[PDB]
Design a protein around this ligand. Structure first.
Ligand code: CL
Lengths: 76, 77
DNA sequence: ATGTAGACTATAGTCGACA
DNA sequence: TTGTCGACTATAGTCTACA
């Protein structure tokens, strides 16, 4: 059960909630499917870098900021 | 082509060269195929988080450090 | 609003062969 | 040593509907 993947999905959900988005909102902005967004947040599905990039765009967060948050989660 | 993917593969190759590894060495350690390692570095192939995780392990670099380097590349040029 | 189900497509990732 | 091509298997990512 992948450590990094679980940190990545955690950061995605955390950012999503801060911005008050629904999964559907993020799906729309990400150009991804709602169910796949759920799969990622809930079941730690293994997304690609491209899909992560689209999600970062959809969440309206810079990659830099995203990875900064990600580093912070890993450090705990 | 994808901006982020190109930064990721760049960091991977850069680390690989610093450690004096061949693609084959990294394939072995990563538990990935040599040709896929080539695909990533050369053709910006779209790896998953799991495969990136395995590569980070194969390169013997912490995720933290990897993403620190990655942030630095993004901040340029 | 979210998660699961299932069936279906595109492509991740393997493998042998050779330049 | 690396990159490629092509063929194969595994799974990311889609879509519909429903509790
Ligand atoms: Cl070069």
């Amino acid at each position: 059960e992948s450590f990094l993947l679980s940190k990545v999905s955690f950061v995605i959900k955390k950012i999503r909630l801060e911005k008050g988005m629904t999964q559907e909102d993020l799906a729309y902005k990400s150009n991804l499917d709602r169910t796949y967004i759920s799969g990622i947040e809930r079941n730690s599905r293994n997304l690609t870098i491209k899909s992560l990039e689209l999600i970062m765009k959809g969440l309206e967060v810079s990659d830099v900021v995203f990875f900064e948050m990600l580093i912070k989660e890993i450090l705990k």
